[PDB]
Amino acid sequence: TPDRLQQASLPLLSNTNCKKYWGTKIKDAMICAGASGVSSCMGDSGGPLVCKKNGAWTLVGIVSWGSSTCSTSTPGVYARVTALVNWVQQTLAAN
Amino acid sequence: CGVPAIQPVL
């Protein structure tokens, strides 16, 4: 467990291609990234996966799950925010 | 939102 905040750039995968690693475990509200030599791991869960869009960092995924050994050759799975943002919006508006 | 005052260096 590192004392200092770590960062890593990694590529987004398509769910179709991600199913080649995880099969049916991949649902529509999930997005994969990684398998590039880096990997999110235990303790990273709940954290951000951000992509720069139009000059601003946007939350695209939330660290969710992946390889039990945090293999850098296997893609990590993140909660797909675009599929959950409507709920976020409704929740804030009502509370 | 999304624009850090301290720019990240990757």
């Binding site: 590192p2 880096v38 925010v81 | -």
Partner: protein, 131 residues
């Protein structure tokens, strides 16, 4: 993060650390505004846990961090713990975070926003660097 690198202190202002009452870091989260934090539903956060903002070195005692109390836990009702689908929880803070150079919000996308495979993005955290 395995094979990642140390971040420039304060360069990911929305990144928060979720710690239990013993001070143990168990999950990350992101500030979307002064009163709300987004995290994973499987992190199993409770109102006894604490949101720490503005932190870089969890081993330092000289950082001006904000330890914020959690008022309510909003687990997405669509969350399925068997498949871990719709893994998102919203935390409403008891005390609003004080935005500064090292504490601010990340943007949220529109439901119709598109992020193509092949795009290089970034992930951050205090997770294990070696399994």
């Amino acid at each position: 993060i395995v094979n990642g690198e140390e971040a420039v202190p304060g360069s990911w202002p929305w990144q928060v650390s979720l710690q239990d009452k013993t001070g143990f870091h168990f999950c990350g989260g992101s500030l979307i505004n002064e009163n709300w934090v987004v995290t994973a539903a499987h992190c199993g956060v409770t109102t006894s846990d604490v949101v720490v903002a503005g932190e870089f070195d969890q081993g330092s005692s000289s950082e001006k961090i904000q330890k914020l109390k959690i008022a309510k836990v909003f687990k997405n009702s669509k969350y399925n713990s068997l498949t871990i689908n719709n893994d998102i929880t919203l935390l409403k803070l008891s005390t609003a975070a004080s935005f500064s150079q090292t504490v601010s919000a990340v943007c949220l996308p529109s439901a119709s926003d598109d992020f193509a495979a092949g795009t290089t993005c970034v992930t951050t955290g205090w997770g294990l660097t070696r399994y």
